[PDB]
Each structure stands twice: as structure tokens, then as C-alpha cells.
Design a protein around this ligand. Structure first.
Ligand SMILES: O=c1c(O)c(-c2ccc(O)c(O)c2)oc2cc(O)cc(O)c12
Lengths: 116, 115, 115, 116
């Protein structure tokens, strides 16, 4: 898979399990079209969102549903979600890992981009 | 002003100056309506976006235009922008500071909510 | 004062108040000598650690006592402390702000170096 | 291995390769004794630092030599190194991953602790 999402919990020091993730792609008419979705595993990872064929050039938005995650743990967090918006594959196909580290009032995100 | 934005540059170890910031409020039909905007100052801060009277409870989106900032520095960035989406709550503290720490392929954001 | 420390709590969305901070300077024999210390204020800031006259070029270590902070909040933390080790440089800008963002199993730290 | 170190470069969006890492353990007399060392691989990971037998309870310091890393890339960075100081195995053996995300004037670090 050319797109993987990895989520960690900075309060517990653990993978963030069962986090819902929705991916969108900006359309020809400039709206956000649903592209893929899934939930993180026991390792905090979400594989198999898309294929090399389907993951064409475009502007993508990865929405990580952090509020639902925290609420299930009894925490009222600040953010509705974490959003990662980026152009993909504009210089040829790449492999993208979107990592996120979650706290109730803060998140970070970093991309690891590799070339096959 | 109940909403402040502060942006830092993790590559240069400096405030992120002249970064455009756009704030939106979610409308009843689920679209994002422009609410306020500005550019960060020499201290990386953006004050005066809104007022207590206007900043009512609701869902807000703060977009920090990071791609243009890195391009101006000659550095190839990953993200289109950094996005902070949150519900404003009256039972919460009175002042929201949205802070962001920027790198070309990473950002963090935190909320500091105080009286 | 050429050295300021600012600490934020990523769990509560607040300044980290009453956090002990110890600063050391590396001695000729490679040991760490106490240099300055204090506790963060209600704004999460620690001002007045040193003076321009005393803060000469050298290697400094700032230890932020995060474990005691989390224990006081009833939260089990990972680290003993957060540690920031750097060389102070006169050709650099005049004022160093060491900022830290704290979670129980994670921290970040950045330097904001300005005139 | 019960101790793994993973390092990412936030400027390039890549693993941080060939980063030197030194681990110390606080001694009976309260000094920092050398415990293990190594360098990160092409994946930004450092495996095989220690064994379950050797990794006893104690206070450990993981020093990631970030200044040397940045200087090799033509950057004069702020920090001498990133230091991660923690008590390990005080409630029985755990597996520890120490992750670090590096920028020239900033780093973050998070621990992922799991139970076997
Ligand atoms: O509000 C601030 C803030 O959130 C951070 C911060 C954010 C994320 C990080 O990862 C980090 O290391 C620092 O720094 C600051 C530095 C200042 O001088 C003033 C600030 O107001 C903040």
C-alpha cells in the first residue's frame, strides 16, 4: 500500500487503537470527495487504504478522528479531529506514512515519504 | 480577544513571521464560512482576530498557510497547510491560544486555554 | 535576561505551573555545575534565571522536572525529566527561549532564539 | 530486544539514518555508566542494543547524537543531543520503543511501552 497511517497515544505510551480515519481527495470541482477509510489496528496502524493504481496524483486530506478516540477513554479533548492535507504523487508514485501523536489538547503529525 | 495564534519555526529556531492564517466557522449547512484572517507578526503572533461578542460557541477551523511560508524560505514542504478544528465552549476558560510548531514534513499544534 | 523557559501541558491545555527547572553549565572537567534554578509561574514561564554578564558562551543543560509535575496531577509519567542540552553562542541572537510541551509519555522542546 | 530506538527527520520526511545512540544506566554510586550503543539503520531504527537478561531495573539515559547528525547534513543545529531519561522495568520487564523526531532547533520524543 502506498498510504499508511500510524497513530500513537502520548498519555498512555501506546499505540492508539481503533481510531477512525477518513481520507478525501480534492475533486475536479474543488470539493472533498471520499477516497478511503478505516480504523487503526492493535498496533496503531492502518494498512490497505488504497492501491498504487487508485492513488493517483492529487490533493489528499487524511482526517484522524481524535475526538471520538479520547471520548471513548473518558477525556473531553480540544480538537474535533487531526487533519493532514498534502499533495501526493506529483513527482511520480511515492509511499507515504502519515504518523500522528495524540494528547487531549495537542497533536503532532509527520510524514515519512519513500521512493518506490 | 479570546482567540490568539502563535506560530514557531523549528528549522530556524524563530517565530514564523508573515504566515497567513484563515479562520472559518462551521455553518448550519456544514460548510465553512470565512470568519477572520490575518498574518503573523514579527513575534509569530496574530492578535485581534475576533471579539468576545462575535466568538460564540460553535465549530471553528484555523488554517495556517505553511506551504507558502516554506516556499518563501526555499524549502520544499509536505503539507498544504496546518489545520486546527475545534469546538469553542463557554464553560471552558475565556482565552484560546492556538500554538503551532512547524517543520517542513511535520507540525504540532496545541491549545492553551486560560482565564 | 538572555534565557527564558516556557512549559506547556498538552493534557490539560494549560501552562505547566510550578514545574521545577534546574540549569547547569558544563565545567572544564566535564562535570555539570549548578548554574540557576527556579519554578515556573502561573503562566508556565520562568524569568530571571541569569544575566547577560553571567551567561557566557559554554555548554548548558536545562532540566525540567516533569516527573514531579505529573505525579502531582495523579498521572503516571514515563520520563524522569526533560533535558535540553545546548551550546550558547555569542554570534547567535541575544535571547534564548527554551519551550517545552509535556505529555505523560512524550515531550517536545524547541529553542526560539531572537534579538 | 526489549529496547529499540527509532529516529525520524522532520526536515526531509525520512528516517534519520546513521544517528549515533549511547545508552547509560545510573550506577549504585549514582553516576552514569555506559550500557549500550549503536547507530540507526537505513530505516532509522536501532535494534539489538541489549537483552532481556542484561536490561534489568534501573534508571536509563538514551542519548541520541543529533548535533553530529545535522552537522553532517550542513546544518548547525541548536541541541548537543536529545536525551531520554527514564526508569525501566520497575514493574517487571517491558518492551520499550524510544522514538524521536528531529528538526534543527527542536526535537520531540515519545515512548511506546508494551508488555511482554
Ligand atoms: O504557545 C506556545 C507553544 O505551544 C509552544 C510549543 C508548542 C509545541 C511544541 O512542540 C513546543 O516544543 C512548544 O511554544 C511556545 C513558545 C513561546 O515562546 C510562546 C508560546 O506561546 C508557545
Amino acid at each position: 500500500c502506498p498510504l499508511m497511517v500510524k497513530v500513537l497515544d502520548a498519555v498512555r505510551g501506546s499505540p492508539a487503537i481503533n481510531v477512525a480515519v477518513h481520507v478525501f481527495r480534492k475533486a475536479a470541482d474543488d470539493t472533498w470527495e471520499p477516497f478511503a477509510s478505516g480504523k487503526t489496528s492493535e498496533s496503531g496502524e492502518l494498512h490497505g487504504l488504497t492501491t498504487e493504481e487508485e492513488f493517483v496524483e492529487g490533493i489528499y486530506k487524511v482526517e484522524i478522528d481524535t475526538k471520538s478516540y479520547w471520548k471513548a477513554l473518558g477525556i473531553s479533548p480540544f480538537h474535533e479531529h487531526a487533519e493532514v492535507v498534502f499533495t501526493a504523487n506529483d513527482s511520480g508514485p511515492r509511499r507515504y506514512t502519515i504518523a500522528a501523536l495524540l494528547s487531549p489538547y495537542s497533536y503532532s503529525t509527520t510524514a515519512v515519504v519513500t521512493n518506490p
